[PDB]
Each structure stands twice: as C-alpha cells, then as structure tokens.
C-alpha cells in the first residue's frame, strides 16, 4: 500500500526551522537519516514554507510556517532491484526511539555519543561484517517474494525485531516482516509459530515453520539476548535516557486558540483544552509528538470557538499537572 505524508512546520524554540511522517514508499522530496516507525511508515526531519513531493501527491503539497517502559528495536528496509536512487538495504537500531546504529557505504556506524564511547572498535568491525551477510540474505528473500507475488519492479521489504522492558520488570519481544508496507508475517514466540494474513505469505510460513531450530533460536534471542543488550545500553545512556526536562508552554490566538509546549523529555505527555473547567472533545486537533532537534520534543493542541467562559491549557509532564489560562470575556 501507499501512505500519503503528514506534514508539520515549526521552530526549535519560539522566536531553527523544522520540516517534519507516516508516509510510504520512502521516495520523498539539512536532512536527518531515514527512520522507521512501528507501523512500517517512514519519517524525516529537515531543519534550517515547505514543499513535499510524493507518489500520493499529484501537485506537491505546500505548508507555511505561521505563528516509562524501555525498548530496543532493530529495523531493516529492503528495496527490490535496481536501487531506484535509494540504498537497497538499510538497517537501523533504536532504543527508546533514540537512533543508535546505522547501516546502508557498508559500515557499522553509531548514531549516539554514548554508543561509540562505550564500545571498542572491535565491536563495530565484527557487526559490519554480520550486516554484509544480512544485506545479501535480504536481497535474496526479496527476489523470492517478487517471484511469489508474480510481479516485478519497485517493491519494499521491511523487517522489525525488538523487545521491551516494562517499568515493573516484565518483558516482551517481537519479530515482524512487511511487504510494500503492509504486514506480511508476524511471529509469536510463545507458541513458536508464524502468522500469515496472505495466501502468498502462507508459503513462507510453511517454509519457516519447517525449520524448528530457527524458531527455537528466535525465542531465545528476544527473551534472553535482546534484553541483555537493552540493559547494557541503558547503563551506557543513563545520562540522556533517564533525564527529565520540563516543558515551556506558550498560548496563541488567530476563533482558534493554539497551545504549544516546547522542549520536554520524555516524549510521554498529555495536553488538552479546558472550558469551565472541563476538557473539550469537540473541534480539537491532536498535533502529535514532534522532535525538537535538541533531543527534546514539542507538541500542540488547538480549539476552535457564551460569554464569561474560561479557556485554559492543561499539560501533564512529570505529573506535575500544569495549567495556563488562555482566554475569557
């Protein structure tokens, strides 16, 4: 399937400009590295109006600027031959949605400061090798798929493996594959079985369940090996990952009332508009969670508009409930 891009334009802190998701295929026009989300979509951050050209857009869309559970994920992005201008294979790792490892020039490269300083150069040399074997193995699985779906040309193959440690200490793990951005194969480590929603995917399911020693191995890695890696990195990034920075709330009007919150970490946050003094469920925009560029984050909530009514902005970060009074007669 193809997903039309969502666009938002905003500044790093109130007066750097950010053009910031949810799109597929990866074809899109400083710029950050290509990133992947849990739903197989991609997201980019371009920082200094904004023009975005995509396959789901006939005319290019224009937007102007006018004013605690921890996880470890690993993504693979495959691109059927030829290159189409994009690297055919890209693998990227994430802990708490923080970029760490980045392979495409075939090198094992860190994306964080605490990643490289805590790891000896032998570590990167060993995994840059693994990745080359993984790149080639991914290409072969791609060709095999195109022959199974009986079509050629541009197609994307995606892999996501990861685990997460709950605040209480409970753990889960997952392995999923996606063809052209749609869920393809889903692995359940409890029953050691693959789930297929497609007649074509069912073929690979019968091949992948035919190998028990692979299935048994995948259970171990998620449950045991992954978590150990997770906790190793957390101790490494104890500085940046365990910090808490408070949001700075700004309110504005243009009818519509805007509520901005700048530079807060962790990304877990809740914002809603209030009227005497209840939360308004109507004529409201979510805004989502956006990257600031500092490693911090910012979001926004708007409401379109009797007399003497009090409109105020509720924000809970550290909880720590914050309220700002925006408007009244």
């Amino acid at each position: 399937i193809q997903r039309p891009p969502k666009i938002q334009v905003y500044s790093r802190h109130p007066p750097y400009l950010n053009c910031y998701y949810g799109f597929h295929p990866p074809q899109i026009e400083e710029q950050s590295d290509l990133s992947f989300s849990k739903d197989w979509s991609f997201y980019l951050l371009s920082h200094a109006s904004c023009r975005v050209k995509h396959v789901t857009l006939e005319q290019p869309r224009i937007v102007k600027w006018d004013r605690r559970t921890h996880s470890l994920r690993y993504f693979r992005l495959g691109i059927s031959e030829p290159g189409y201008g994009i690297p055919e294979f890209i693998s990227a790792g994430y802990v708490d949605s923080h970029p760490i490892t980045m392979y495409n020039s075939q090198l094992k490269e860190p994306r964080a400061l605490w990643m490289e300083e805590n790891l000896a150069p032998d570590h990167w040399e060993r995994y840059t090798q693994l990745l080359r074997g993984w790149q080639q193995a991914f290409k072969v699985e791609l060709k095999q798929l195109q022959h199974h779906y009986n079509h050629s040309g541009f197609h994307t193959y995606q892999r996501m493996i990861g685990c997460e440690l709950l605040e209480d200490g409970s753990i889960t793990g997952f392995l999923q594959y996606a063809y052209d951005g749609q869920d393809f194969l889903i692995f359940n480590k409890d029953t050691l079985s693959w789930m297929a929603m497609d007649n074509v995917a069912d073929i690979i399911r019968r091949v992948w369940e035919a190998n028990r020693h692979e299935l048994q191995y995948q259970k171990n890695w998620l449950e045991e090996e992954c978590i150990a890696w997770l906790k190793r990195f957390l101790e490494y990034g104890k500085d940046a990952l365990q910090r808490t920075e408070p949001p700075k709330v700004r309110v504005n009007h243009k009818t519509t009332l805007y509520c901005r919150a700048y530079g807060f970490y962790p990304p877990e946050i809740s914002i809603n508009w209030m009227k005497n003094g209840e939360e308004i469920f109507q004529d409201t925009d979510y805004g989502g969670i956006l990257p600031s560029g500092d490693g911090t984050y910012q979001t926004w909530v708007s409401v379109e508009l009797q007399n003497g009514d009090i409109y105020s902005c509720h924000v809970e970060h550290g909880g720590v409930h914050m309220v700002l009074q925006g408007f009244q007669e």
Partner: antibody
Framework: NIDQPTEMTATEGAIVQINCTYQTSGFNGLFWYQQHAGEAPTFLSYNVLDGLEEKGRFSSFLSRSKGYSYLLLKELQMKDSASYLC??????????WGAGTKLIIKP | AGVTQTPKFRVLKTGQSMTLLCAQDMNHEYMYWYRQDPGMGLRLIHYSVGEGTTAKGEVPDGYNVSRLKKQNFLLGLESAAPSQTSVYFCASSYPPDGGNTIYFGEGSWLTV
C-alpha cells in the same frame, strides 16, 4: 572458555554421556559435531532453549543457566567411535570451538 | 552437492608458496578456513561474509585469503614455516543468525 572430557571409553551396545561446560559472554546456541579420525566434522545436534532434543539413538540436553550440556548416545555401535565436538554460539555470532571428547568403542 | 577442498595432502619445503581451494555448490554467503591441531579445538584463520569481502579470524599470520566468486574461497601461505604443519579444514555455511549449521570441507593435510 569451554571444557569437555579429553577421552572416554565404552563397550559396544552400551550407553554413554559426554558433558560440556562453557562460559561465554552471551548465548546464541550450542552445536554438537561428530568428527571421525582423519575426517571432516559433521553436524549432530543443535540446542537453544533449555530442554532435551532427541534424534534417533542420539539425544542432546542443555541448561543455559548452568552453562551445561551433555550428549546422550544410546545403543553404541562401532561406527560411533569418534571425537564429539561441543561449541556454543557466543553473543556476537562468532563460534568458539572446544577440543572434542574422543570416544573409543570396545567391541 | 557439498563442499570440495583441494588438495587433501601436501608436502612442502620451508619457504614455498602454495594455495588451497574450497568450493561450494551450495550457494551460501559465508566461507571459513580452519586449522586443527592435536589437543586443540578448531582455530579460524580467516572468514568471508560475502563475495569479495574477507576478514581476519582468530589466528592468521601465515595466511592471506581471497574470494573469487561466491563459490570459491582460497587459502594461501606465501612463505611456508614448520609451525604451519596442521590439518586444514575449509567450510561454508549460511550466516550464523541461527541456528544455521556449518558444512565442512573434507580437509587438507599438510607437512610442513
């Protein structure tokens, strides 16, 4: 580091057990290999989860916590006389080979 | 199919340059070369992840390695030493993302 007996000796038709103790950084699996005298090593068993694995007369057990694994050979024949190599799969995917247990089958 | 390793025997005077072939009909990425000695487990001289790319293994002073095709993996020692007497094994397998068994070559005996 990895440790297994240097040599063992049993009579044909009996049942033998070869122990293997290993300490590695992580654990990605454990392989048992059979290498006859003056020949190439061949695959026997592979274990990851804690438990047993039976294939024919041969059976393999593994305990991840203890770092222990034994290889259970039942109904020993004369062709069973060889070296049995234990090697686990580490954390990074390098493979660490220990010097096998040489089994000598008496008729 | 299988993995083929030539030769199986060789006698060398010290200082001789000689090469050892290894070939897979099996269509794998990975290729290994090993050196087995008495009382010691296998020791990896060099490994090749994919065609054209190789890397130093556990013990490789004497040995320089190249990868022609996906099918061929060459070993070489340009200057022979008495300490290089051993029983070499070539070996090709799928990547260790597992459990992926490793397939072994019939071996090469060497003295010196």
């Amino acid at each position: 580091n990895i440790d297994q007996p240097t040599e063992m000796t049993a009579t044909e038709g009996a049942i033998v057990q070869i122990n293997c103790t290993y300490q590695t950084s992580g654990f990605n699996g454990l392989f048992w290999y059979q290498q006859h005298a003056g020949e190439a090593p061949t695959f026997l068993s592979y274990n990851v989860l804690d438990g047993l694995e039976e294939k024919g007369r041969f059976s393999s057990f593994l305990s991840r916590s203890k770092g222990y694994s034994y290889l259970l050979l039942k109904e020993l024949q004369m062709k069973d006389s060889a070296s049995y190599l234990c090697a686990p799969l580490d954390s990074n995917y390098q493979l660490i080979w220990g010097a096998g247990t040489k089994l000598i089958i008496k008729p | 199919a299988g993995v083929t390793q030539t030769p199986k025997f060789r006698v060398l005077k010290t200082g001789q340059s000689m090469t050892l072939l290894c070939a897979q009909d099996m269509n794998h990425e990975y290729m290994y070369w090993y050196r087995q000695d008495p009382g010691m487990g296998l020791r990896l001289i060099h490994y090749s992840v994919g065609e054209g790319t190789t890397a130093k293994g556990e013990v490789p002073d004497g040995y320089n390695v190249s990868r022609l095709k996906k099918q061929n993996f060459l070993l070489g020692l340009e200057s022979a030493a008495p300490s290089q007497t051993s029983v070499y094994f070539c070996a090709s397998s799928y990547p260790p993302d597992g459990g992926n068994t490793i397939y072994f070559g019939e071996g090469s005996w060497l003295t010196v």
